Ligand binder design. Structure first.
Ligand SMILES: *C(/C=C/C)=C\C(=O)[C@@H](C)[C@H]1CC[C@H]2/C(=C/C=C3C[C@@H](O)C(=C)[C@H](O)C3)CCC[C@]12C
Lengths: 237, 11
């Protein structure tokens, strides 16, 4: 049976996501215009925007406030790119293997991601991830839970209070496991939890590749000028 | 530690 507390957690996550995720993408206009490292100014801004939205989602997660701010900081810094990649799935379209944001100018393709400082080494595995995640055909409830579980990870380096961070994660993971069983019908249900957890593992690797690529881009001072200060603080550290 | 903007958004 799905419990009242667990139903509460799903309602909170779904609403927090609606508040932090606009399917219109209206704000995209605020970003520096994309050029088709022509993309980098535009895409750095989108990531900087995405970071802010991820933070707003993270605050809403039940039990996240209980954590020390330092622990809040460590989780967000390490998970930010991963959550942004998970969130992106919503815009990502199988039809063209690209992220569609509503307009041609805001529609993003491997060349565009390449256009702004990223190797295929990152991009080829990332596109595979979006395809595999899309295949899962997750309920919005599942997608929101995965993002939350990803943010609250006990193992992230620098974590002070893993015991608390695991206890918060466990409640979210139990809610997801119970939700799949109670509200997810076979066959889609089949091995659905384990597959979602595998996606978290794929994220870690994607995150690591991003770190090394960002650092290479970061090392050149001129390229670093293109980025936002919030991007420099989080991914730059 | 040296995360001024991220800390402010977290508040
Ligand atoms: C990496 C550079 C390091 C210096 C740059 C980069 O462009 C990499 C990080 C990727 C990560 C995710 C990618 C995209 C995300 C798209 C969206 C669109 C909407 O669904 C949305 C609002 C999400 O928050 C993110 C596609 C473009 C490249 C991208 C930023």
């Amino acid at each position: 049976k799905l419990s009242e507390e667990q139903q509460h957690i799903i309602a909170i996550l779904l609403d927090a996501h609606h508040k932090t995720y606009d399917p219109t993408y209206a704000d995209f206009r605020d970003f520096r215009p994309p050029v088709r490292l022509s993309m980098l100014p535009h895409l750095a801004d989108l990531v900087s925007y995405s970071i802010q939205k991820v933070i707003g989602f993270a605050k809403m997660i039940p039990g996240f406030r209980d954590l020390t701010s330092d622990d809040q900081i460590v989780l967000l810094k390490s998970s930010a790119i991963e959550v942004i990649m998970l969130r992106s799935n919503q815009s990502f379209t199988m039809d063209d293997m690209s992220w569609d944001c509503g307009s041609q100018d805001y529609k993003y393709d491997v060349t565009d991601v390449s256009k702004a400082g990223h190797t295929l080494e990152l991009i080829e595995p990332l596109i595979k991830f979006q395809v595999g995640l899309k295949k899962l055909n997750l309920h919005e409830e599942e997608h929101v839970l995965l993002m939350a579980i990803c943010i609250v990870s006990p193992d992230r380096p620098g974590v002070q209070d893993a015991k608390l961070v695991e206890a918060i994660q466990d409640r979210l993971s139990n809610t997801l496991q119970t939700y799949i069983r109670c509200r997810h019908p076979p066959p889609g249900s089949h091995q659905l939890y384990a597959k979602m957890i595998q996606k978290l593992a794929d994220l870690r690797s994607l995150n690591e590749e991003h770190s090394k690529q960002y650092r290479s881009l970061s090392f050149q001072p001129e390229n670093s000028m293109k980025l936002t200060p919030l991007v420099l603080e989080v991914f730059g550290n | 530690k040296n995360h001024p903007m991220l800390m402010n958004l977290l508040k």
